[PDB]
Each structure stands twice: as structure tokens, then as C-alpha cells.
Amino acid sequence: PNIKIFSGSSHQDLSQKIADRLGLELGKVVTKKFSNQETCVEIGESVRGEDVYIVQSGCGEINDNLMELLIMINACKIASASRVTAVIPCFPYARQDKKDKSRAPISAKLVANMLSVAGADHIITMDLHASQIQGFFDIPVDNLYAEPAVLKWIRENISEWRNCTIVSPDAGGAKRVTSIADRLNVDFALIHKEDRMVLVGDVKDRVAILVDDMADTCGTICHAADKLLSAGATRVYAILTHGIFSGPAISRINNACFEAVVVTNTIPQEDKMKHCSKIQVIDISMILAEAIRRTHNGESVSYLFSHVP
Amino acid sequence: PNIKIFSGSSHQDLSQKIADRLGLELGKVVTKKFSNQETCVEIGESVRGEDVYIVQSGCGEINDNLMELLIMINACKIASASRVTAVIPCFPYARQDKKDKSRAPISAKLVANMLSVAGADHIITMDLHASQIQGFFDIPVDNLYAEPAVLKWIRENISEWRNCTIVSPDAGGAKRVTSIADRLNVDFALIHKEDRMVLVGDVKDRVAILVDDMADTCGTICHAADKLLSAGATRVYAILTHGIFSGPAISRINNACFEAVVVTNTIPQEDKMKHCSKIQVIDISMILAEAIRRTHNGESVSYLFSHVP
Amino acid sequence: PNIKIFSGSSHQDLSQKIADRLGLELGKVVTKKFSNQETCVEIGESVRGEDVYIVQSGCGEINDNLMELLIMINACKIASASRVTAVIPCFPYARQDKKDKSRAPISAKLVANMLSVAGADHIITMDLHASQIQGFFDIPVDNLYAEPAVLKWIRENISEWRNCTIVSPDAGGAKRVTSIADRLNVDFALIHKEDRMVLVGDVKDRVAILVDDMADTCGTICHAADKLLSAGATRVYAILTHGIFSGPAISRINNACFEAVVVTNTIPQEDKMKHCSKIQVIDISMILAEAIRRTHNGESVSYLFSHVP
Amino acid sequence: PNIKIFSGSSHQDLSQKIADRLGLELGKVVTKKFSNQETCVEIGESVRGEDVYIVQSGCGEINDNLMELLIMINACKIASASRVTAVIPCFPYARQDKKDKSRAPISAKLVANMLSVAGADHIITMDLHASQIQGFFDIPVDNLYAEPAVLKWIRENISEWRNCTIVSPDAGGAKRVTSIADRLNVDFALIHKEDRMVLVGDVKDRVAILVDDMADTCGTICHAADKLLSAGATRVYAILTHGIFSGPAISRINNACFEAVVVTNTIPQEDKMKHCSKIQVIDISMILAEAIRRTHNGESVSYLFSHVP
Amino acid sequence: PNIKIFSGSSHQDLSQKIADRLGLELGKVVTKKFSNQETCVEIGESVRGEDVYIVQSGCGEINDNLMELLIMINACKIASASRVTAVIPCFPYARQDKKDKSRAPISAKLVANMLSVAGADHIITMDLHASQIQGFFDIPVDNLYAEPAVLKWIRENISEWRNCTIVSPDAGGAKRVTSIADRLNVDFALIHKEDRMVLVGDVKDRVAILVDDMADTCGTICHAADKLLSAGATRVYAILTHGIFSGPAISRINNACFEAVVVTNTIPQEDKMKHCSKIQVIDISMILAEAIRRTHNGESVSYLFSHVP
Amino acid sequence: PNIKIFSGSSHQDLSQKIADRLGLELGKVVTKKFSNQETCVEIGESVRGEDVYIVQSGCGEINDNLMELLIMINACKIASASRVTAVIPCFPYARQDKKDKSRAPISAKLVANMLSVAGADHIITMDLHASQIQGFFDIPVDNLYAEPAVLKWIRENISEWRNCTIVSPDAGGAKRVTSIADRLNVDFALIHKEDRMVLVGDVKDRVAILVDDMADTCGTICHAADKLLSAGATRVYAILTHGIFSGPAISRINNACFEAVVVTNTIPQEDKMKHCSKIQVIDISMILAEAIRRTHNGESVSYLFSHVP
Numbered sequence A, B, C, D, E, F: 001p002n003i004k005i006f007s008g009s010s011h012q013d014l015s016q017k018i019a020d021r022l023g024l025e026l027g028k029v030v031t032k033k034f035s036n037q038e039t040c041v042e043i044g045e046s047v048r049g050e051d052v053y054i055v056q057s058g059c060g061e062i063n064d065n066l067m068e069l070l071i072m073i074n075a076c077k078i079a080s081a082s083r084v085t086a087v088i089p090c091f092p093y094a095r096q097d098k099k100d101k102s103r104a105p106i107s108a109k110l111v112a113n114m115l116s117v118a119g120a121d122h123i124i125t126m127d128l129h130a131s132q133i134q135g136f137f138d139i140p141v142d143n144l145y146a147e148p149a150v151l152k153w154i155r156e157n158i159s160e161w162r163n164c165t166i167v168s169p170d171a172g173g174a175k176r177v178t179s180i181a182d183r184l185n186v187d188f189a190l191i192h193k194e195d196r197m198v199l200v201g202d203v204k205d206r207v208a209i210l211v212d213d214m215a216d217t218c219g220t221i222c223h224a225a226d227k228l229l230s231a232g233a234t235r236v237y238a239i240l241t242h243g244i245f246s247g248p249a250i251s252r253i254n255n256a257c258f259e260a261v262v263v264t265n266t267i268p269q270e271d272k273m274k275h276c277s278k279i280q281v282i283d284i285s286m287i288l289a290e291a292i293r294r295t296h297n298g299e300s301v302s303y304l305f306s307h308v309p
């Protein structure tokens, strides 16, 4: 069985980068819409007995991309692929992970069920919003971390990183920032709202680094940056693995006081970078390519949790 | 257990009509989008131990409506509804029912699987494109027919209906037109392409009635009407249960020679009727309401196959 | 269908209380061990067509209790009970909810799968460690909150509760304490370690109230109380819904500086209260009885989230 | 894919022997208990793409061992092992194979379901109490027989084996003893109770050999030996594949009249042999190692049914 | 929901008797064959929301009857029956319950799986060949016993029944005969082959009663009767719940020395009674009717295990 | 059948509270007067096959409220409600329960007869003036007690309640005060007139608690309080379930020496509390809601006699 890399419509640049780092060409697939807005998927090459990897991120027009992904998975499954893996850098509906005193659907579980019934045997994703989403599946799920690439960017871009601070925008981000701080050996502050917020950890004359999993409307990071500047921090950085940047996000970032908003390219950012000069992008295509290659060859994937390939 | 009728965003008028004919109010549900194009569903009333019916048609923005439908089904299922029924007047992806020498997904089967895994116990639909789609499910599926309402419209709108002709636009429509002709006791012609088409059945000075399940781009009915006028038919009618009317459909119908294009309101048509004066709408909300009420009360549903309620 | 309440061996007092508040007698079941440590379960009364509720908490000898619970569920399922509900006040293996950079099993998902395959149709539990565990099941799960009873105890036991403070022992407890503070209209502090910990929120001359979901070894609450007394708080309270109290817990609580350690009786505490004079117990059997009765009668269960029955 | 052998806590000696006969080292796994009696399993080596075999016998603290086994299976399954096999020399709850006019659970079926849902693809077991338990699974089950090793022991340990007798302790043991007698070409007696028992088959001055699948409380074999000595048999032997030896078993065997109680090491017997001088152990680790190796290499496993490796 | 009783083609007399004892008419169903030997099933009445019971015995042309049964179950399931129960007085392939050192299918498990996937929610059967077959299903299975009717026949037909003997034809029949003997308070003999057989239990001048679950080729009962007459028993009786009577059975019974071969009407016997004057039939339709009625009304079914209705 | 709660004009606040505690909306009913003072009742929703509860208290303009109640009962009865229950917290004409040497009507019996002939199937009332009024009906009557709520108020409002006294204003109130005293374990005094009255029971320096069923003109409680202060009691309390407060009542209470006059909200008191600062109100809407819910669900209602819901 050989690796076949297929791209959805959501993130073609990421898929091309991944295929480049594997020494492959993207699989021949036509993904369009009929006139009635129905997804049309045609696999243009035989995938019989192959190790198929479909790259599709939960971004853009989310329901359309998810439908395309499910249809591609099912097409490869009934075309007798030996194994079908969904490479989903940003997991759709990941924030619908709990009910919490509401008659709300756990939409992430529904997405996991639909991926399972489409025929996915393996999920590769990056920085799941909640790790418990791994339990929503009955198939193996590899949850990669952008932390190696984030630390690399911090070291090569913040000259004052030995005295800097790693700040979480909310309580739920504590573990990630603590890990980052430990690997950098730096002090780590915290922030949480009460319309007011409290920041704990000395930041005066010290660079603050907000680290968080995603920014959708950028209310969280903007409030955090406001408070960080209240406490007299010199410069403020925001680092995110998923730059959804929806709605008022670009205006808020433009009107905010960040020195940089760094995001990983799990979501295409070219358009967002057009209208916001302070957005920078970390390439994580090497981590995804390495994970695909290691799952194919049966090598350890947890090695990546601590090493940049 | 009491009937609860919930509406999706796709066809709110149809749901309101159905709820009216059942003497009920639509269930309290909020269906919106987050900023990142993610479906948000909130059931505003307890459905515990109730007989929930969700009305949503595979029209408009199809993937968005299907995602909303699945999310609503799952929300009602994990909110402890006794039974959840998906009322899907136009089944999405119904035309993806077969592979036919292509590495194509059978998307209708995938939709059936997703409806099953969301937790639907019953499907009510109208004029499935292929009856074999009933076999795609492991739950009961009630496939209603618009034929009663169609015959009623023909009798009350075509004064020459005793001498008229019932014509199929393609080979695959033969059974429906034969049934219509038998119930009307009229001659039935046929049409099939060869860029040329052949029409069999005397139509000169006789009204032709094209009857078909759906019109998406209206190429089929337009070519059929062209040939019918070649054979000297006096007036031409098109009757359809699903008026998708996507892409060039409205321009084609406006430039065509139909005396009327009649569709059933399984899909909202107000906007299409705005730009096409020859589209008429048959109400089928009574058939849907009667089917919902008969499934709830355990009465025979196959009774509707031959009787207008 | 009538309510049948069955008790496991884990918490017989709680089951008797629940049956009392429902006006019922506990179902006739023999639960013993064979000589080879194998669970023997014998339902002594017909459950055919009944609404069976099995009360068993993930406490004591956990694997034995879980096996007994699964065996009872399966026995009632193949004895033709109409519906089987597992009332699990403390969910076993709930802390194994994620992998987090380790080749660790998500044991909570395995427990959910085993409960599903034994034949449980409904789960009633109290204060799940992670709400995402609700997504581990495909059946409905009712996750009750001890917050109503906790607020009642605080108001009737802490005369200074209008000026008091609600403190979380770790970051992951933020939401619960914020809800408690909002319903009491009090200031809410926070605590997190760095061997050192930082406390945010004025507590001098003010009573601190640690609120947390469980205490297993009581390291978390003991460190939190140490820091709270460092910041000069007058008296310190710990409130918990699950008092596992395993290992060095009783000695730590005896050597600690709590004014009271209050727990809810989701786990039997008679033995622990024998060796620790500062443990108090909140009865939550009324919430469980009300939830059982409301699920049986089809009434709203989410009503309990805000009201003491 | 390479063989990985993992040991549970139940029978570490058997697992070490099996790994020795395969030329392997036991896989690196930590299996302990948290303070609250919860099973903790940590796979210390990557099993990605490997052929994992977990050795765990339904002995000792049975529910704890079964939970450990299920947790290990699930851990290896979601760690992307190519195939997971449960090597279960003594199947837990095997005697709960039928209902038989009681509202009793078929606990063996529940255990099979839990093994399936944990993710086991293959079961290797020895001398199932009922062969129909193979039908409880939907995965392949290899049910090895200790008969080759038993015949070897009889021939090398009973000098009078050509004139001896093979006796069943109950009716349900008839097939096994008949097979043993046929392979030895000896007369076979039978025993069954009526507090009295009847023995059929001449045994005077002839050695009797009780052969049975398991001895739990040793009431069956002790009553059989009593009757055999009533009929004037010279010496009495008991041979068993599973020596559970629970409760009053050791005292009964010490007070009985056996010349030897021979058991196979599907269960650890060191402790039991400490307090009973007449217990002897047949090694069956070679049969288990050969079965593991033959399933891995795709060679015939049914070959072992008649040949000692 | 009301009881609907449907008959297959296998045993129409039994179904009519059952419907009579329930005060019902048999449901309107057409069960025929197309020209190509394909089963055609048409439910002639609505079963929507009803409690459907399909009576079909594993007799006659077994594969044809089983296919008809599965097709009827599926037809009633997708016709929206509330609950479908398969009343299978003689379970097909019940003797294929184990592998036993052969690459043989466990066909009984396959039949259980097919019944489950057709949509059966409940199985009612009589005297399963192995009780472990109840574990082959994941749905409830009621395994009725003919013992009440057998004891009634013995008491009303064998005037010497207080001094008689209850004999098992093989080892595997021990439990049934022991139960019969206990309820009659009589001595119980046993028989097993070695071409020779041994009988244990005094039978001289005493009537022997062979009791067994089924007679297929009647080799077992004929050899048992031969040995019983060797031991000087006065008269010999054979009692069976399933009279398959295939192949040389009728000639063997005619040439044998039975005073009577009594069978229960789980299989039609009119044709067999035509060519064998010593076959008598016990009606068990009352037990089946009582079980159907008690499962419908939610009353105890295990009551029948000891009482003739 | 579902619960329908309808409010009369007498006590709309109580009905809204009851509907809130049942999770319902008040039924749509228009209750007005024509110009000629005639009651107009229009049920605005179908009550066919429903469980109708009409809440109306014998207060305010009593004859008008009673006529409205009877008209509503009759309207729901001839609108085919399955069952109609009159929830009458204060029973009108309850004090006309006997003749007693006068040509007086037993008006309470007449009211019971009119309620029966209007079509009421069930009466729920609170603290009937005479229990024998239950015998005036031939339908079931549930006579709830305010004693649980009264004891709760006493314990949470009179800090000296362990040494207090429970005093009856007249002889006819003996049973109620004795029950209250027994549940509180306190001494109970008594009072009865001779223009003079005698008080029995030590009250010096002890709080006296007058407990009585109703206060109409408050002559009884005012004379009792006068005597209690004659005997040197420190503070005096009056507790009543029905605060009619007609005529000179408010002036008498204002000029009296009560520390508090506590009443239950069986009658609206907002207007009376406007002109009397010492009137406090106990909510009993939870008892009424619980009784309605328990009668609907068939649960025990006599449970409430001893427990606050």
C-alpha cells in the first residue's frame, strides 16, 4: 500500500505543502458543486489497496467542507482503499463538546459519528479544543501539538524570550501555556475576567505572550491584551494555532495593541493577512507531513510531541 | 407522548402550514449561525418523552440545511425524545443513488447513514428520486406521492383533461406517468432523446402533460417541450413535485413554450415565482400533515397513496 | 410501566433514601460473590415491561462495583425490562477522560461503551468530572449538579456568606465556583500552583470557600487551604460533591486547617466520618429521586439545575 | 508487524514463559492501581502497526483482572496496533453461560461483548467451560485443549496407564474423558450423583483417573473420589486444566484420598501448592506460545489439537 | 398496541391453535414462491404500532422457512410495527452450536445474527437444544419448557408412573430427565454408549421412559430402547419435544420396541403419524399462547416454567 | 392526557405560581362579566382528553368566584376533558357546615352538590374548616395541610421556638395545635372564652403562638392575644392558613399586640399587606403544585401531609 494524498477545497495550499514534503503529487480528485449546491466528488485515480489521506480543515464554509470530506472518505472507502485517514488540521464543531445546562447538541460527537460512519479509520488533527474529543471516536485519533513550532518561532522572533512571560487568555488555556513556559523556562502569568479582568504574574517591562488554541472573534485575546497593557507590559504577543478570524476579528486586531498575532496555517490566512498587517503565519505542514509519514510507516507519532521534524 | 413539530431554516412556510393543519404551534427552536459559519441549534422547550417531527427540505443551501437537520435530530435524541422523525419533503443527494461505472460516492447512502447515526427513528419523504433509497435505511421510511394532488390539479385546471396526454420526459419516469394516466383514463405518450428526441403517442391537437419528479436545470423538460411542439401538440404542461430551479432554469422556462410549470411546495418557490410568471404551486402540506398525524396515531399511512385528505 | 429501584452493593443507604423519597421499596435483588470472587446477581422479581433504575456509585472497590452494575443492567435488559437506567452518582474512571501526550487509555470512554453494550438506555449522574463525558455515550445522559444543595448548605451554615469568597483549588474548577458566586452574589478568588501557589482575590478577614468536584487524596484542597491561610483568610471551608477520600486523605484533612470539609453523599462517608470529625455530608438523595421521578414521568429534568426539590 | 507480548497482573509467570518460548521480551507496560482502586495502565512502548498479544487469565481478583485486560486492549487499540489478541487461558465468568429457569445474567456473553467493544480482534483461550461460548463472540476464538499435555503427563507418570480408567466427575464431562480414553485406548468409567452417586465401569484394583475442566471448590472431584474409593479402586487421580481452588478447596483436597491432583498452569498455583502437597502442575505455556506463533504466522492452529509442540 | 399473530408456511395448524387460544384471527399475510423459488411475502393488513408475533418453526424445508421468517420479520419492521417477536417453536440450526475441533460454522449463531438484523426484538422458543443459544442473541429470548405438558401426559397415560423410570438417551440429556424425575418423585436411570451401551438404574419389571429434546434420525432413542430391553424392562416409552423424524426415522420406529413415541407439536406430525401408529402428539399450543399473552401484557413468563395454563 | 392549569379571577398570582412549579403555561381562558353582571367564560384552547385543573379560591367576591368556577368546570366537562379537578385553596361557605338548632342551610353541602353537578371529578383543597366536609362530596377530596409550611416558618423565624408555646384560639382548634406542638416537641397552651377567657398552660416569659385555620374578622385571634398578654407572655404570634381579613380585621390587627400575623397565600394578601405591616405570607403554592402533579401521575398525595416538597 502506497500513500495517496487527497486535498479538499478548504486548504489547497496546506495539502500541496504536505504532498511536497512527502515527495508525492496530490491525488487526482475533482471536487465541485452542482447547480443546486450539492457536493460533487470524483476520484480520478484508483485508490484500491492504497493508504489514502484526505486533507481538509474545518474552516471557511464549514458545513460544505465537512460534507465534501465525508463524501470523499466514503468514496475512497467503497473504492476499496485499504485504509482511509482524515487529516483535519482544525476540527469542525470542536467547540460544541459539552451540553452544560442547556438542551444543546454535542455537535462534535455528531461530527465524530459521521466521520466514523463515512468510513474513516484514522483521524489526524492538530490542537483539539478539548482533548476529550479523542474519546468521541472509536477509531485512533492522533492529536498533534503546535507547541514545537510555537517555541521555535518564539526563540527565533522574540529576542527577549528568556525574560518574557507566557500568559493564558482564559482559565481553560492553563495547561498549554504552562507546558510552553516549562520548555522555555520562563515565568507564566494568567488572566481571567471577573467586564473586568485580573492578571496574576509580574509583567512590568516584560514582554507578555498570549498563547491560546484559537481566535474566532478575537474578543478573548483583545480583552487579555487590554488588561496586559493596563499592567504596564511593554509589548504584547498573541500566538494561536487556529486563526479562524471571523466577523469583527480583523477590525479588532487592527484596533488592538498586539505587536504580533501569530497563527499556524491550519486555516488559510492569505486573505486575512491582506487586511491585517500584524498577522504572521507559522508553517505546520512539516508536522502534518511527518505524522502522515510516521503513521504510514508504523513509526512512533508521539515522537513529534517534543521534536520539530 | 404528544406531537412536537420543529422547523428548520429551509422551508418555514411549509412547516407553519403543517403545524396549522395539526392544530399545533411550531416548537420553540433557535437555529442560527455562529460567526464562523457553524450551525447553532437550541431547543427552547423540553421534548422529553415526546413525538418529535423535524421538517427540513433538501433545498437552498443544501449542506447547511442537512447539517442543521442532523444537529436538530441529535439534539432531540439526547434530550430524551421518545421518537424523532425527520420530515424531509425533498431528500438531499437523492440523485447520487448509484455508481454506474464511476468512482463516485453513493452520497444518498451516506446521507441515510448520517440520518441514522444522528438518531432518526423514522423518515417521511415525498417522491423519492429512486424508490431503492428506502432500502438505504434500516429504519422505516414513508415515501409519499404527490400523485393525488397532481390529479386534483389536472382535473380542476385542464378543462380538456379527458382527451389530454401524459408524457414522460425520460425513460426513467415511465411508472409515474403510467399511474397518472391510469387514474385519469387517458392516453400516455413517451419521450426520449437519441441531440434529437423521439415522441411516441398521438398528440396532435391534444394537450401534452409532462410529468416528472424534479426539475433542477430544466434541460429535460425544456427539450421534451421542444419535441412536443415539434409534433404539433396544442399546449404543453409540465408538472413536478420538486421545483429546485437552479442555475439557468428560470431563463429556460421563460424562453420555453410551457403553458404552465406546476410544482409542489416541497421547496419554497416564492422567489422563483417572482421571476417566472408561469410557475404554479400545488400545496402538499395536507398530505404531509396527514402522514405525520397518521404515524403518530398508528393509523394506516398507505391510505394516502390513493386519497386526498 | 412502573418504577423499579434496584441497589448495588456500593451505596445501599443512598438507594434506600431514594426509594423512600419515591414511595417505593427497593427491588428484590441478591448481589453476592462466588468463592472465586465472581459477581453473582439474581433479580428476585419480574422486571418485565418495567422502568428499571439501578443505583450504583463508582466508589469503594471500583472494578467490582462496575462489574456488578453491568451485570445487573444486562440481567434486567434480557429480562425484558422496558427501559434500564443506570443511576451512577459518582462516575467511575471519570478522570481518565483524555490521553494528553501519553499512550494512556481513555478509560471513561471504555466504561461508557461497556454501559452501552450491557444495555443501558439512560444514564443519570451527578457532577461529571468533565462534561465532555456526556459525549462519550450515544444514549441520553443527565448530568445533575450539586450546586443547589451546596448553596443551601452555605446559606444555612456560614453566617458570613454575604461577604465570603468562593475559591477554586485549580484552574479547571473555574466555571463551578463562578456559578456559585453568581448565585450568591459574592466575590470569587482563584488559586493555582506555579511547589508554590498564587491566590488572586482579596481574602483577608474574609471566609474562603474552596469548591471543587472531588477530593481523592486531598492534596489539591490541602495545598489550596495552606495558601489561603498564607493570605490571612480567617476561616477556610472545602466543599465537594464526591468525597472519595482515599489513601492519605483522612490524615491530611486531620492535619489541615479546614473549618469544615463538606461532601455530598454520592459516596458512603460513615466510615470516613468516623476518623475525621470535620467531614460533613450534604444529602443529595432528593435531587436523585426527583431526577428519577421526572425522567419516569417525562417532566423537565433541567428544572433541577436551578431548584432544590 | 511484529509480535508484542504484554502481561497483565494476573499470571506474570505464564506470560514470561510464553515470551521465552517465542524468543521475545515482555512488552513494557505499567499496570498499577490508583489510591481509589482504579486500574492504571500505561503502555511504555509504541505498539503502532504491531501484532499485540495480551496475556491475562480469569483468576485471582477476577473483576480487577478483567478490567485491566479490557483497559489494556483498548489502550493498544487506540494506540494504532494492527491487531490485538486477548490470550485468556482461563475465561472469566465462563460458568455463567446459560439462564436455565432463572432471571440470571448470561455473564459470559457480557464479558464477550465487553472484550469486543474494547477492541479485541482475536481470542485465544484454553478449555472453555462450554464450547458454545465461542458463539458468544463475533470475532475468531481459538479454544485450545490441554488434552495433549494431559496424555503426556498420564503416560509419563502413571505406570499402570494401559489398564487404568478415565472417569468423569459429572455428566457434562463425558466428551473430554471419552476423547482421552480413546487416545489412550483404555476403559472409561462414569460418575454421577443421584447425596449418593453411582459409578459405572469396572474399577476394582484399577487406577481411576478423574478428568475435568475445572475445580473451584473441589466438591465435585471430592465426591467423585469418595465414590471411586467406595467401589474399591486402588488409587485415585484428579486431572484439571483450571485449578481455581477457592474457598474450602485446599482443606478438602488435603482431607481427600487423591494420589495426585494435577492441574495445568492456566492459573498461578505456587501459593496453592504451598498448602497442598498433592497438587502437581502441567506446563501448558508451550501450547499457548505455539498458538500465538501460529496465529501470527498464519499457520494452522487446529494442528495443536492433536500434537504437543 | 394490539397483538397480531402471523403464520408462516411451516406450521399453520400450530399458528391457528395459538390464535384460537388468544381469541384472535391470524393476520392477513400471503406467503408464496415466485417461479424462481424466491420467497414472496405480502402483509395484507397494516401492522403500524402493533405487537406482531410471527409463528414459524424450524422444520420441513428449513432454509425456505427461515428465509420466509426473516423476510416477514423485516416486512413488519419496516412497516412500523412497534415490536416484532419471532415465535420459533423449534429453533433452526440449533444443533450447530459449537465448533469442537473442526473448521465448522456455528450456524446457530449465524441464525441468531440474521434474526437480529432482520429486526426481531424478541424470541420465543421451546426447549432449545443448548441453553447457551440464549447467549447468541442480544435481544431477550424466552426458552419455554415442555416439561409441564410432558408430566401431565405421563400422569394421565402411564398408570404405573409412580414406580416408573426416567431414562436419558445420552449424557447431554441428564438435566431434563432429572428435573422430570424430581417433579414425579421417581427413580431415574441413565444410558450411554461405549457399539455397546451401558444402562445404570434398576429397570427390571419397571417401565422405562426415555426423555430427550429431539429425535432426528431416531438412532439415539432406538439404541437406548434396545439396551433398555436388554436389561429386561417391561415397556419402553420415548418422549420428545421435537419430532423431526427425518430419513430412516419412521422405519426405525416401526421396527423398534417402543410402546409409544410421544412428541410435542412444535413440528407438524400429521404426515409422520400417517406412517407410524405409535407416534402420539402432546399439544403445547397453550404454553405458546400463554407466553405470547404474558409477554404482551407484561406478566411473568417464568411462571409457565412450573405451571400448565 | 396532559395537565391543563386554568386560573379563575380570584387568585391569579397563586395560579401563575402553581403553573410555574409544574413547568406549564396557564391555560388560555377568558373570564369576564357581561354588562348585566353575568359571568362569561370562554376556554380558548381545546381541552379534549386532557387533565384539567381549575384554580379558584373562595375569596373576594365569593358568589361571583364560585359561579365562575362552576361555569368553568361545566365548560371543560362538556368540552370533553378526560377529568376535571377543582383546586379550591379556600373552600367557600365552609363555615356553613352544620345546622345546630337553627333553620339554617348547610351551605357547604349545597356548594359540594353544585360542584358535583357542574361535573367536577376531584377536589383539591387546603385546611378545610371541618374535615367532615370531605363527606359532603361523593367524589374524592384531597384536604392538604399547611402544617409543613407552618413548621418551616416557625423554625426559620422564631429563634426561641424550642421553648415557645402553641396556643389554640378556641376549643375547635385543638387538634391542629396539638399536631404542631408534637412535631415541634413544645408545650401547648389553650384558650377559651367564658366576655372573659381562660388560658391554660404556662406562658410567662415564653413566646405564645396562636395557630388557627382562618381569620375573618380577627375577633377570635384578637381576644386570644389580649388574654395571652394578660398572662404575661413576652411576644404573641398568630398563624393562619386563610387570611380572609374582612371588615374590621385590618384595624383590629393594627390596634392589637401581635408580633406577627402570618397567613398562607390561599387568598391574595397584597392589598391587605398594604394597610397592615405585621401581615406576613407563607407560600403554599409548592404544596398545591405537588398535589396536582401527584394526582396526575398517580403518586401518593398523603406523602405531602408530612413532607415539604
Ligand SMILES: O=P(O)(O)OC[C@H]1O[C@H](OP(=O)(O)OP(=O)(O)O)[C@H](O)[C@@H]1O
Residues within 6 Å of the ligand: A095, A169, A170, A171, A172, A173, A212, A213, A214, A215, A216, A217, A218, A219, A220, A221
Ligand atoms: O471567539 P473568541 O473571542 O476569539 O474566543 C474564542 C475562545 O473560545 C475558546 O474558549 P472557550 O470560550 O470555549 O473556553 P474554554 O477554552 O475554557 O473551553 C478558545 O479557547 C478561545 O479562547
Ligand SMILES: O=P(O)(O)OC[C@H]1O[C@H](OP(=O)(O)OP(=O)(O)O)[C@H](O)[C@@H]1O
Residues within 6 Å of the ligand: B095, B169, B170, B171, B172, B173, B212, B213, B214, B215, B216, B217, B218, B219, B220, B221
Ligand atoms: O437538471 P434537469 O435537466 O432538470 O434534469 C433533472 C432530471 O434528473 C433526474 O433524471 P435522471 O437524469 O437522474 O434520470 P433518471 O430519472 O432516469 O434516473 C430527474 O428525473 C430529472 O428528469
Ligand SMILES: O=P(O)(O)OC[C@H]1O[C@H](OP(=O)(O)OP(=O)(O)O)[C@H](O)[C@@H]1O
Residues within 6 Å of the ligand: C095, C169, C170, C171, C172, C173, C212, C213, C214, C215, C216, C217, C218, C219, C220, C221
Ligand atoms: O487527588 P486530589 O489531590 O484530591 O486531587 C483531585 C483532583 O483531581 C481532579 O482535578 P485534575 O487534576 O483532574 O485537574 P482538572 O480538574 O483541571 O482536570 C479534581 O478536580 C480534583 O481537583
Ligand SMILES: O=P(O)(O)OC[C@H]1O[C@H](OP(=O)(O)OP(=O)(O)O)[C@H](O)[C@@H]1O
Residues within 6 Å of the ligand: D095, D169, D170, D171, D172, D173, D212, D213, D214, D215, D216, D217, D218, D219, D220, D221
Ligand atoms: O466448584 P466445584 O465443586 O469444584 O465444581 C466445579 C464444577 O463446575 C463445572 O460443572 P457444572 O456444575 O457447571 O456442570 P456442567 O459441567 O455439567 O455444566 C465444572 O465442570 C466442575 O465440575
Ligand SMILES: O=P(O)(O)OC[C@H]1O[C@H](OP(=O)(O)OP(=O)(O)O)[C@H](O)[C@@H]1O
Residues within 6 Å of the ligand: E095, E169, E170, E171, E172, E173, E212, E213, E214, E215, E216, E217, E218, E219, E220, E221
Ligand atoms: O438423530 P438422532 O439419532 O435422533 O439423534 C438426535 C440427537 O442429537 C442431539 O444430541 P447430540 O448428539 O447433539 O448430543 P448432546 O445432546 O449431548 O449435545 C439430541 O439430544 C438427540 O439426542
Ligand SMILES: O=P(O)(O)OC[C@H]1O[C@H](OP(=O)(O)OP(=O)(O)O)[C@H](O)[C@@H]1O
Residues within 6 Å of the ligand: F095, F169, F170, F171, F172, F173, F212, F213, F214, F215, F216, F217, F218, F219, F220, F221
Ligand atoms: O371571624 P373571626 O373572629 O376571625 O373568627 C373566625 C373563626 O371562625 C371559625 O371558628 P368557629 O367560630 O366556626 O368555631 P369552630 O372552629 O369551633 O367551629 C374559625 O376557627 C375561626 O376561629
Ligand SMILES: [Mg+2]
Residues within 6 Å of the ligand: A095, A172
Ligand atoms: Mg470551551
Ligand SMILES: [Mg+2]
Residues within 6 Å of the ligand: A170, A172, A173
Ligand atoms: Mg479558552
Ligand SMILES: [Mg+2]
Residues within 6 Å of the ligand: B095, B172
Ligand atoms: Mg437518475
Ligand SMILES: [Mg+2]
Residues within 6 Å of the ligand: B170, B172, B173
Ligand atoms: Mg428522470
Ligand SMILES: [Mg+2]
Residues within 6 Å of the ligand: C095, C172
Ligand atoms: Mg482532570
Ligand SMILES: [Mg+2]
Residues within 6 Å of the ligand: C170, C172, C173
Ligand atoms: Mg480539578
Ligand SMILES: [Mg+2]
Residues within 6 Å of the ligand: D095, D172
Ligand atoms: Mg455448567
Ligand SMILES: [Mg+2]
Residues within 6 Å of the ligand: D170, D172, D173
Ligand atoms: Mg462439570
Ligand SMILES: [Mg+2]
Residues within 6 Å of the ligand: E095, E172
Ligand atoms: Mg449436541
Ligand SMILES: [Mg+2]
Residues within 6 Å of the ligand: E170, E172, E173
Ligand atoms: Mg442429546
